[PDB]
Design an enzyme around this catalytic site. Structure first.
Site: not given
Ligand SMILES: [Mn+2]
Ligand SMILES: [Mn+2]
Length: 190
Positions: A34, A84, A88
């Site tokens: 993920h 992502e 992040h």
């Protein structure tokens, strides 16, 4: 940042919550990445300003990313990787550039085989109830530290399903440490 949460998701379960449209994850039958989330004092660091996502910097990792980090809910894989990185990855950019960040995640996935750890104990996914303590115990026995388990409850049936497994790492992105937070109850479907 003081640590990382390496989050893997179980496609079949994630897809079940998307009741609006189709979903690839139903076809995927292994744990996929993920994301790799930098942490700070117990919270996930998100949306840090940083370098824009550059697809050319990870072109050499495409085959591995398409098989280990495919999107389950988004339009396509590249869009998911970009998301992502922007949400992040930029938060740990001081120490890990884009290429290093994605390579680290791929390495973590290759070294943390959840299904392999559960098979011997007949605790693999079968759509039946599992116990939180047992699953955490099986992973701790193999890898050495406790994982974090994340569940989601179906609004309709109110049944709880395991959706993600978290492996916690120190700021070096290599030293495995104990996770200390679950969102799962004592039992859940897996
Ligand atoms: Mn996210
Ligand atoms: Mn968002």
């Amino acid at each position: 940042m003081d640590s990382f949460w390496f989050v893997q998701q179980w496609p079949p379960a994630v897809c079940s919550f998307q009741k609006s449209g189709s979903c690839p994850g139903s076809g995927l039958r292994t744990f996929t990445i993920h994301g790799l989330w930098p942490q700070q004092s117990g919270t996930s660091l998100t949306n840090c300003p940083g370098s824009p996502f550059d697809i050319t910097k990870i072109s050499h990792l495409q085959s591995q990313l398409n098989t280990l980090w495919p999107t389950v809910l988004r339009a396509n894989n590249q869009q998911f990787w970009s998301h992502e990185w922007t949400k992040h990855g930029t938060c740990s950019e001081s120490t890990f550039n884009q290429a290093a960040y994605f390579k680290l995640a791929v390495d973590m996935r290759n070294n943390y085989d959840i299904i392999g750890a559960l098979r011997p104990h007949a605790a693999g996914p079968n759509g039946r109830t599992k116990s939180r303590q047992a699953i955490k115990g099986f992973l701790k026995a193999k890898f050495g530290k406790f994982p974090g388990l994340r569940c989601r409850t179906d609004p309709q049936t109110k049944v709880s399903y395991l959706v993600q497994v978290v492996a916690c790492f120190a700021q070096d992105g290599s030293t495995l440490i104990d996770c200390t937070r679950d969102t799962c109850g004592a039992n859940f479907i897996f």
